[PDB]
Ligand binder design. Structure first.
Ligand SMILES: O=c1ccn([C@@H]2O[C@H](COP(=O)(O)OP(=O)(O)O[C@H]3O[C@H](CO)[C@H](O)[C@H](O)[C@H]3O)[C@@H](O)[C@H]2O)c(=O)[nH]1
Ligand SMILES: OC[C@H]1O[C@@H](O[C@H]2[C@H](O)[C@@H](O)[C@H](O)O[C@@H]2CO)[C@H](O)[C@@H](O)[C@H]1O
Ligand SMILES: [Co+2]
Length: 284
C-alpha cells in the first residue's frame, strides 16, 4: 500500500520542520507529490467533506468568498460535499459548483455569545457525523468561514487526523504558546509541555477521528462550563489539549492557512489559504 516515501520528501524543505518525533509529516510546499496521491486516492474512489459555519453577520460576505474559493481550489479532481451550517437559511448565497461538487445546508440555532457559537460547532459537527457524514465521505475537514483558498488545497492534506500550524506561532517557543494555563480548566497544558500551537480554523481527518476530536473537545468545554471557567481561546484551547494527548497523523504548514498581516517570509513558498481580516467589532 502507500508508504510515506512514495509521496513525501522532507529533505526538499530543509529549513523548516517537516517531521515530528511521532513520525507525522509536516506538509510544506515542495515536499509532496500530489500526482502520486491523486492517482492513489482516485483508485480508492474517495469523497471529501468540508463543514463550514456562518452565523449572523458572517453569513453573507465571508460565505460567498469561502465557497467560491473552495469550489475553485479544494480537492479538485475528486468528489466533494460542502456541508453548510447557517442560522438563517434565506441569507445563504447562491454559488455555482463545479463537476463532482454538491452541498447540503442545515439551519442551526444561533448561540447568544460569540464564544459559544464557536464552541458549539464541536457538538453540531459530531451530530452530523453520526447522522450522515460518516456514510457520505472518507475524509472530512472543518473550517472557519472567515478565510479564502488561494491555491490548490489537495489530497496531500488528507490523513487520519490533520492539524494546522497557527501562522503566528510556528517558530515560537512552546512556553510562549497561548495554551490554557489554569489547572482548573480541562484544556490545561503546563509550561514546558506541548509540541505545536495548532490553529482551530482548520482540522480534519476521517469521520471517525473528527468525531473523537469534536466529542472530546466538547466534553472539555462542558466540564469547564460546569466549573464556571471558559478557556482562554475557547475551542482552540481544547483542540490544542486534544492534539497534545492524541497526536495528529499529519500537520499542515502555515502555507495552508496564512495571515498576510505577518508578511511573507521565505518559509512561505506558496499560500494555499489565507485569513480574512478579523473584525470582531464589525462582523461579530
Ligand atoms: O458571529 C459569529 C461567530 C463565529 N462564527 C463562526 O465561528 C468561527 C470562529 O470565529 P472567528 O473566526 O471569529 O474566530 P478566530 O479565528 O478569530 O479565533 C480563534 O479562536 C476562536 C475561539 O476564541 C475559534 O476557536 C476560532 O476557530 C479560532 O480561529 C468563524 O470562522 C465562523 O465560522 C460565525 O459564523 N459568526
Ligand atoms: O493566540 C491564539 C489566537 O491567535 C490569534 O492571532 C493573533 C496572535 O495571537 C498574535 O500573537 C498576533 O500578533 O496577531 C494574531 C492576529 O490577531 C488568532 O487570531 C486567533 O484565532 C487565535 O488563534
Ligand atoms: Co477564523
Amino acid at each position: 500500500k502507500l508508504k510515506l516515501s512514495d509521496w513525501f520528501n522532507p529533505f526538499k524543505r530543509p529549513e523548516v520542520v517537516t517531521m515530528t518525533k511521532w513520525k507525522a509529516p509536516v506538509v510544506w510546499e515542495g515536499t509532496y507529490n500530489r500526482a502520486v496521491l491523486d492517482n492513489y486516492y482516485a483508485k480508492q474512489k474517495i469523497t471529501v467533506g468540508l463543514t463550514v459555519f456562518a452565523v449572523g453577520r458572517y453569513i453573507e460576505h465571508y460565505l460567498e468568498e469561502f465557497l467560491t474559493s473552495a469550489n475553485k481550489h479544494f480537492m479538485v479532481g475528486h468528489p466533494v460535499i460542502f456541508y453548510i451550517m447557517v442560522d438563517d437559511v434565506s441569507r445563504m448565497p447562491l454559488i455555482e459548483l463545479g463537476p463532482l461538487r454538491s452541498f447540503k445546508v442545515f439551519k442551526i440555532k444561533p448561540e447568544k455569545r460569540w464564544q459559544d457559537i464557536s464552541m458549539m460547532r464541536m457538538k453540531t459537527i459530531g451530530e452530523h457525523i453520526v447522522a450522515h457524514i460518516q456514510h457520505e465521505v472518507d475524509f472530512l475537514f472543518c473550517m472557519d468561514v472567515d478565510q479564502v483558498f488561494q491555491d490548490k488545497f489537495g489530497v496531500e492534506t488528507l490523513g487520519e487526523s490533520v492539524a494546522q500550524l497557527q501562522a503566528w506561532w510556528y517558530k515560537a517557543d512552546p512556553n510562549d504558546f497561548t495554551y490554557e494555563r489554569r489547572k482548573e480548566s480541562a484544556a490545561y497544558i503546563p509550561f514546558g509541555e506541548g509540541d505545536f500551537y495548532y490553529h482551530a480554523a482548520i482540522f480534519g481527518g476521517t469521520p471517525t477521528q473528527v468525531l473523537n476530536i469534536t466529542q472530546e473537545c466538547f466534553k472539555g468545554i462542558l466540564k469547564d462550563k460546569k466549573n464556571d471557567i471558559e478557556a482562554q481561546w475557547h475551542d482552540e484551547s481544547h483542540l490544542n489539549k486534544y492534539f497534545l494527548l492524541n497526536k495528529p497523523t499529519k500537520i499542515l504548514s502555515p502555507e495552508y492557512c496564512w495571515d498576510y498581516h505577518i508578511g511573507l517570509p521565505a518559509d512561505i513558498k506558496l499560500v494555499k489559504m489565507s485569513w480574512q481580516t478579523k473584525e470582531y467589532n464589525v462582523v461579530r
